[PDB]
Symmetry: C2
């Protein structure tokens, strides 16, 4: 049962990490986003495909409150960032994903992240603000690698899951978005593949 569109009922997994000004998806600002789409070789093995990355600028009515910013120590309005607009990044991400979905034979995108549902809610609220009416991501489903890894390897913590999975993980580079996203994707793939390897797939 080769082919990605048969592995998750038409869902096109896309690994996503976000970095934010604060905990609140509706009020607090989006600062950075990384996305990696996945592809499946003629043998049914899963692997990264495209990688995108952006630094985002705070949206208009954003929460730019001293106490809130200070909390996680970042300056969003710092002009030395190479940041693009919320719309620009999401537009570009969605665009790749859409191309991916079409070409893969899938019907919808599903986000893959560690503790996924929180990042998910951030990237939805943002696309709404952006007015991206053709958001290809499922509005509530997510593959959360924390649970997957708990099943797959008995580990729930991203670092520890990676280490156990046999891959290496650099705790220094840690909570930088791209690195995370990238590790996660590999971790997510290993888990899916390892499941095939042990004859879980197909049925």
């Amino acid at each position: 049962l080769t082919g990605l569109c048969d592995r998750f009922r038409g869902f096109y997994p896309v690994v996503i990490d976000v970095e934010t000004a604060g905990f609140n998806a509706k009020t607090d600002a989006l600062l950075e986003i990384a996305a990696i789409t996945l592809k499946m070789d003629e043998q049914g093995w899963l692997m990264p495909d495209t990688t995108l990355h952006f630094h985002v600028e705070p949206f208009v009515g954003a929460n730019l409150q001293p106490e809130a910013l200070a909390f996680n120590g970042i300056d969003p309005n710092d002009p030395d960032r190479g940041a693009v607009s919320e719309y620009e990044a999401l537009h570009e991400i969605f665009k790749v994903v859409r191309k991916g979905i079409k070409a893969s034979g899938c019907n919808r995108a599903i986000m893959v992240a560690h503790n996924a549902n929180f990042d998910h809610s951030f990237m939805m609220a943002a696309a709404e603000r952006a007015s991206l009416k053709r958001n290809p991501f499922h509005p509530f489903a997510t593959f959360d690698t924390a649970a997957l890894a708990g099943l797959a390897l008995g580990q729930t913590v991203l670092s520890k899951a990676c280490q156990t999975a046999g891959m290496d993980f650099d705790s220094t580079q840690a909570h930088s978005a791209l690195y995370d996203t990238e590790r996660t994707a590999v971790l997510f793939c290993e888990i899916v593949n390892r499941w095939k390897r042990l004859g879980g797939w197909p049925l």
Copy 2:
């Protein structure tokens, strides 16, 4: 390695469903040889013979608290289908009903929609159950007790298949 506190880094999984107000919880246990199965079922009808929101939670917690201590685990984790929905409600309720010793982890959850995704390539609970060859009657899916029980069996079945194919232990 044979025992809940070994399987999930010490988390004690508790399958939970909420429906609208009604709530059901099933705890799990492992046999001598390390197969997962339902331990205790709890089911309540709650007013937002219906019990209070405090009672329901207090009683569930009481059971979970006991099971953890008995199985050498360290915290409860909530197993649910699209778990974050139910998990949110729960924690709100716990707070709102001023509950002293909540055993549940504050944001971690085992979501069966994803586990099913991996293990059976289906996301919807009904589909996941049938693919796993379990019985599933959707007319009935509006019942929190029916849903939970199916979810628990499904979850045990995923976890157990993984063992069966040899993905666990990792290597005792």
